[PDB]
Structures are given as C-alpha cells and as structure tokens.
C-alpha cells in the first residue's frame, strides 16, 4: 500500500523554524513529483511548493518564496519542507502529496497523507483537563444511553479523541473545538446500548501531542 | 495567477438524485487537447481525494455516479444519484499553470426528513469540583434540519455567559446534524443553585425539549 506519513508539527512562536518531514513507502518514490499543500482554518486549499521527480526543480507559492524550501532524499524515500520566517498566515494542515505519473503534461495529486498541523503563536502550551460526563443519578435508562467526554483547557490544537481505544466507532460525535479566551475546549459523545454499560467499560482516550499528554478516562456512573 | 470560481457555494440535493457544481477558470487551462482541471473531494477530518482528472478521466477506486465534463475555461462535476457518504465539500484544482491554485470549494448537504434531537445533560464531574470550576453539558444529537437554539436557565432565570456552543457537520451515515452545548461557572457559584435546565427549541417540535439536572436529586 501507499503511505505518506507527515510529521515534525508543531506550535512555534512568530519568526521561529520548523522542519517537516513526509515519509514515503508502497510505491516508487523518485518516479513521482512532490508537493505541500496546506490548509488554513478557513479551510481553504493553498498549493505552498513543488519539487520535481530530480529534485533539480523547485517551485514556491508567492506567500512562501524565500522564507520556505522544500527538498527531496530519494535514497529515504523522504520529502522535506523548511520553514523559516513563520507568520499566523502560516497556521495550518500541512499535506504531502503525490502528483500521478503521468505524460503529456502536469498532474494531478492522486495521494495525500493525514496531514500534520502546525501552529504559529506567541501563546504557550496547555495541557487539556479531560474529564468524565456520566448521566445524572434521577435519570432514566431506555434502550439506549448516552456518554462523553469533556476536553477543556488546552493549546494549541489538535487533541484526538477515541472511545475503548477504536472500539467503540459509531454512535460518536467529538465536536469542533471552540476557542474562548485563547483556550480551546472541546466534548465527546457516545450512545451505546444501556445493557453494556456499566457492565462492560467505557474510556474515553485523549491526546494531544504538542504537551505530550494522553489521558484516559473511564467513564463511572455516580 | 490563475483564479477559480466555483458554483453554488454551497448546494443541498436528496438522496438518489442529481448534484452539478461549476468552476470557471479566469483564463484557459487547456493543453495538447487535454485540459488541466482536477476534482476534488474533502470530507470533514480527511485529506482530500482525487476524484477526476483532467475534466473527464474518473480516478480508480471512486464510484461511476462521479463524472466531469468541460474544456478550456468552464468545468463542471456531476454526482449521480447522490448517496449519504457524499457529504463533503468539493475543490476545483487547475495544473496548467504553476502556481497550481484551487477554488474556494462547494459544499453538499443532503436533504431529508425531518428530525427530532434526542438531548441529554450532563452534571459537572467531581473531579473538575476539585479545581474550583463546574461545567454542565448538554449534547442534542441527530437532528434535521441544522437550524437549532439552546437556551440555559438556572432556577428558572436564564444565562449567556459562559456558554460555550459547537456542531458537527452533517453525518454521512444518516445525514444528520448534531450540536454540543457546555455552560461553565465557579464551582462556588454551582452550589448556591439547584436546578440546571437546557432547553432546545427546534422546527421539528412547536414546544422546546427540555432536560434537566437538580443538585437535591
């Protein structure tokens, strides 16, 4: 299979560097043209620079000419993207894609990894406070019964969230997070079956990478 | 600098029919007879996907209900029939020219049945007791349509500060909407009240839905 993983993501204050990294494997790295995409919080899409199957050609996006480079070790089967001169412009998802092989002309990017986030501000890390959310002790059981998970507190984003460590997949909803008084917060729901809980377990798992925190709470009833 | 318009900005169709959305390209993005126009699908979480490349050629492993038409400088994507899992915004992407640029995307949403939220309120954990706050949540899951307002009150007399509110976007299982609703205070002031209520008025319900939470039980 085709992989590209990003990494090196992280919060970093106004004017400093960063480093990120894709990971290639499953496919025949230095036949294909690279590029870092990214995505800012408004979501719209901005192709940020392009490298050639080489690495002899290069070519940037306005916005990043001379402050970013991007460069290729084909022998690691890695795509590089330096970064330099950071701005709040330059908050966002970082993609690594791969452009289709194909003649007569430019292409296409046919594959592209999760993405790696990167936050550009003179605000610090926070941890998040997870905490349970069991029902109320008066209220009633009927068929199904609801629980969550609340993340409060915490800087930058992203936190990720699971229930029974991948488990427990549908009847999930985690919420966008919210930014109030430059701290998000953000909460988890599960419904499940009111036979298996309490009986069986229930845990919500957090984690956010850029205070290396990862919690996981088991949900109680009171 | 090639320049993208994408229309409608957003677009909401029901289920098994059909769905076109259009790129104009600010100039031409043909070549050698081919054209240079991408698809692209985002769905909320993921990266995107190719769906169509060069106007016409359907990307392997994507269903034949996606197909694009066009040339030079007018593009469009058709969807047919529409399914639940096409939820997600889609982006136009020309290569003809570097830099390579997108349009500002179209966003599909699904038309349904209306329905009812089913709400649940959640009591502050004692373990956030502790450290002096208290936060009471309320989710209001699966409804259509996305139009919704949440009102707190605490011993009958409502408040708007410290009220946080979030939703998901659509579901791509049962096209539903869902929201979040968490009022924090001081756990101080938590103990002085009783009765924590969040009311939920909804088109699918003339009267509001409430649920509520008292600390005598």
């Known amino acids: 299979e085709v992989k590209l993983v990003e990494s090196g993501g992280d919060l970093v204050k106004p004017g400093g560097s960063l480093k990120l990294s894709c990971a290639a494997s499953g496919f025949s790295f230095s036949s294909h043209g690279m590029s870092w995409v990214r995505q800012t919080p408004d979501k719209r899409l901005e192709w940020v620079a392009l490298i050639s199957r080489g690495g002899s050609y290069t070519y940037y996006s306005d916005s990043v000419k001379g402050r970013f480079t991007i460069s290729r070790d084909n022998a690691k089967n890695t795509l590089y993207l330096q970064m330099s001169g950071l701005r709040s412009e330059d908050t966002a998802i970082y993609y690594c894609?791969?452009?289709?092989?194909?003649?007569?002309?430019?292409?296409?990017?046919?594959?592209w990894g999760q993405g790696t986030s990167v936050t550009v501000s003179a605000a610090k890390t926070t941890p998040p406070s997870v905490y349970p959310l069991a029902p109320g002790s008066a209220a009633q059981t009927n068929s199904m019964v609801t629980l969550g998970c609340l993340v409060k507190g915490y800087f930058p984003e992203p936190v990720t969230v699971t229930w029974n460590s991948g488990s427990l997949s549908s009847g999930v909803h985690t919420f966008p997070a919210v930014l109030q008084s430059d701290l998000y917060t953000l909460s988890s729901s599960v419904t499940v079956p009111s036979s298996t809980w309490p009986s069986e377990t229930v845990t919500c798992n957090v984690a956010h990478p850029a205070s290396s925190t990862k919690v996981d709470k088991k949900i109680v009833p009171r | 600098d090639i320049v993208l318009t994408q229309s409608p900005a957003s677009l909401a169709v029901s289920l098994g029919q059909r769905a076109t959305i259009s790129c104009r390209a600010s100039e031409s993005v043909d070549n050698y007879g081919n054209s240079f126009m991408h698809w692209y699908q985002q769905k909320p979480g993921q990266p995107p996907k190719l769906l169509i490349y060069?106007?016409?050629n359907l990307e392997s492993g994507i269903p034949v209900r996606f197909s694009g038409s066009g040339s030079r400088t007018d593009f469009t994507l058709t969807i047919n029939p529409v399914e639940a899992d096409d939820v997600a915004t889609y982006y136009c992407q020309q290569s003809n020219e570097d830099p390579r640029t997108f349009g500002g995307g179209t966003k599909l949403e699904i038309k349904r049945a209306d329905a009812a939220p089913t709400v649940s309120i959640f009591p502050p954990s004692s373990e956030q007791l502790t450290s002096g706050g208290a936060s009471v949540v309320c989710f209001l899951n699966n409804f259509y349509p996305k139009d919704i307002n949440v009102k707190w009150k605490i011993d009958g007399s409502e408040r708007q500060n410290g009220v946080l509110n979030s939703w998901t976007d659509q579901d791509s299982k049962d096209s539903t909407y869902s929201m979040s609703s968490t009022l924090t205070l001081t756990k101080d002031e938590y103990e002085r009240h009783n009765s924590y209520t969040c009311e939920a008025t909804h088109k699918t319900s003339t009267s509001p839905i409430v649920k509520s939470f008292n600390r005598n039980e």
């Open positions: 060069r106007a016409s």
């Open positions: 894609t791969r452009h289709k092989g194909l003649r007569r002309g430019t292409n296409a990017m046919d594959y």
